[PDB]
Amino acid sequence: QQDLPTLFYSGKSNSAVPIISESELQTITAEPWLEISKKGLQLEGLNFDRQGQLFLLDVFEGNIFKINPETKEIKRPFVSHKANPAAIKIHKDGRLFVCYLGDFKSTGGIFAATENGDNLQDIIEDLSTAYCINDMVFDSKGGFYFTDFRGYSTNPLGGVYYVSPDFRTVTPIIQNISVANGIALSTDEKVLWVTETTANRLHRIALEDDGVTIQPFGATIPYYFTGHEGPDSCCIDSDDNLYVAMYGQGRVLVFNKRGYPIGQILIPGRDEGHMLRSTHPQFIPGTNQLIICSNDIEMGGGSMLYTVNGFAKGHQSFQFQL
Numbered sequence: 108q109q110d111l112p113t114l115f116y117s118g119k120s121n122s123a124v125p126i127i128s129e130s131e132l133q134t135i136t137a138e139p140w141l142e143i144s145k146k147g148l149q150l151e152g153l154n155f156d157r158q159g160q161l162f163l164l165d166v167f168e169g170n171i172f173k174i175n176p177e178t179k180e181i182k183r184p185f186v187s188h189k190a191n192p193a194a195i196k197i198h199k200d201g202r203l204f205v206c207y208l209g210d211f212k213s214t215g216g217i218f219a220a221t222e223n224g225d226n227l228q229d230i231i232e233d234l235s236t237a238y239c240i241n242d243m244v245f246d247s248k249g250g251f252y253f254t255d256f257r258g259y260s261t262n263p264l265g266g267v268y269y270v271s272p273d274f275r276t277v278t279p280i281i282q283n284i285s286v287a288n289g290i291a292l293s294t295d296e297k298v299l300w301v302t303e304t305t306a307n308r309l310h311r312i313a314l315e316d317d318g319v320t321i322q323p324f325g326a327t328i329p330y331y332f333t334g335h336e337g338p339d340s341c342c343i344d345s346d347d348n349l350y351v352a353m354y355g356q357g358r359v360l361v362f363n364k365r366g367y368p369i370g371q372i373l374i375p376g377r378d379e380g381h382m383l384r385s386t387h388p389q390f391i392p393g394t395n396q397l398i399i400c401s402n403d404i405e406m407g408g409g410s411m412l413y414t415v416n417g418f419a420k421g422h423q424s425f426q427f428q429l
């Protein structure tokens with residue numbers, strides 16, 4: 108697909124530190140790519156495997172879907188045995204890691220399994236930990252950072268934690284976050300991006316070489332989002348731009364490597380209150396074609412994946428590591 112709405116490095120989108128308002132951002136409207144269901148499913152957790160196949164899920168029913176981007180064929184290999192799964196991150200060894208929220212209070216955690224639902228492993232046990240995990244991102248060593256999705260605006264119970272490659276140690280990276288949601292590592296893995304949903308803030312965290320210590324005055328707030336509900340999941344491209352799905356806003360915002368907004372992707376029907384639940388953005392491996400999932404549960408509609416071409420090709424994350 109080459110005739111898809113595309114984002115270019117023109118105007119202020121090509122500036123290192125653009126001074127601009129959201130209404131002035133280079134904007135494009137996403138094209139419908141594939142309807143998952145006529146029924147309302149809370150789509151989330153987009154992630155491609157080493158073979159370029161798309162894996163995603165729906166929070167409330169816990170269905171795990173596998174999609175052939177080429178044929179548009181949709182399969183449903185298995186259903187999560189844990190309540191409210193919210194993200195899927197594929198390991199370099201092929202396993203699917205599934206972050207779940209549980210009861211939203213503390214019964215969340217992370218489990219791993221084959222693409223067919225076999226060999227269920229408790230990476231982060233649910234009942235023994237207070238965590239309710241929404242997303243995660245693997246570093247090149249096999250360790251990973253995850254977001255603790257808890258609390259609300261003035262009750263910052265959330266935060267970000269790092270799990271060692273052997274999965275035996277959990278280390279706090281940054282805490283006192285009002286519902287940490289989205290998370291991403293820069294291409295050099297020295298910068299961690301985190302979205303705080305209930306406070307509408309974007310966090311940029313500069314890390315030391317050990318991957319756990321924050322550089323002096325290294326955790327900052329480069330951007331204050333606006334509108335109900337707030338920032339959700341995010342991913343980066345090979346140019347270190349950050350794509351942030353805005354939950355309840357029917358759009359995705361794109362920031363350059365310095366945390367400045369350079370692009371905006373609208374979901375068809377948002378003005379009328381449709382498809383406002385845009386939750387996750389992800390690139391088709393080896394290309395700059397972006398997929399975005401959203402749903403019309405609020406308006407009694409269905410679940411749909413949308414698409415556009417981003418500023419650059421998707422980044423080669425952990426599952427694509429050789």
Ligand SMILES: [Ca+2]
Pocket residue numbers: 213214215216232233234235236237238239
């Ligand atoms: Ca837990």
Ligand SMILES: [Ca+2]
Pocket residue numbers: 151193241242288289339340386
């Ligand atoms: Ca999310």
